[PDB]
């Protein structure tokens, strides 16, 4: 009854995946039934992730995927606001689709982190030392028996460090969200894990996520369509 997708083992250009995802996103923009709207939005999201993955591993011309993954995260956030999973009459299809969306969003946040992760150790070093090194403007030292002044570069560095750290903070929270929600469709997702191999937080690559989500979408389609 359940069938596994035989996957296209070509590595097309990022432009090809971008056009594919735009076609799917506009199919979804046109549709009126929110569930099929959301299914096609997740299909487009998978193609967008493929476009970013191609921007990364394009052998003879590599560009940056960070805006791609970020805007795709925003697309997933929009998508989840159509068929709310915590709704009273929320079907099993809505819940499984939400779990797939959450997996995609968590892993995309994690990549967004890892694309700029090199800055954060550097910045943690120097920002820890300088934020023990800021004690001014309100109380002078008080020998015994408010507002704070910090250097400009320290401020910009703290801003960028928070910007980079928010990414895995969201990734961790959304991954735990996905884990928890998967308990209410444990059988569906145990079969999916058995067929595809489970998604690993810090290990699964974008192609693993693409194939896993496409398999889940295939089963969701057959259960409704």
Author numbering: 902 to 1046, 1081 to 1160
Lines quoted from the article behind this entry:
In this study we identified AFF4, a scaffold protein of the Super Elongation Complex (SEC), as an important transcriptional elongation factor required for ESR1 gene expression. In mammalian cells, the active form of P-TEFb is tightly associated with additional elongation factors ELL1/2/3, EAF1/2, AF9/ENL, as well as AFF4/1 to form the Super Elongation Complex (SEC). Importantly, AFF4, the scaffold subunit of the SEC, is largely responsible for this histone mark recognition activity. AFF4 belongs to the AFF(AF4/FMR2) family which contains four members: AFF1/AF4, AFF2/FMR2, AFF3/LAF4, and AFF4/AF5q31.
To gain a better understanding of the molecular basis by which AFF4 interacts with H3K27ac, we set out to determine the crystal structure of the C-terminal domain of AFF4. However, we did succeed in crystallizing and solving the structure of an AFF4 fragment encompassing residues 900–1163. Surprisingly, the 2.2 Å structure shows an all α-helical homodimeric structure, instead of the predominantly β-sheet YEATS domain-like structure. The ordered portion of the structure, containing residues 902–1160, with the exception of a disordered internal segment from residue 1047 to residue 1080, forms eight α-helices. Helices α5 and α6 are extensively involved in homodimerization. Phe1103, the residue identified to be important for H3K27ac interaction, is located in the middle of α6 and involved in dimerization via stacking with the same residue from another molecule. In consistent with the structural result, AFF4 dimerization was abolished by a rather large deletion of residues 971–1117, but was not affected by the single mutation F1103A in cells. Our structural result contrasts the expectation of a YEATS domain suggested by sequence alignment, and precludes direct participation of Phe1103 in H3K27ac interaction in the present form. 901–1163 domain we crystallized is not competent for H3K27ac binding in our pull-down experiment. Our structural result reveals that the 901–1163 region of AFF4 is a dimerization module, instead of a complete H3K27ac-interacting domain.
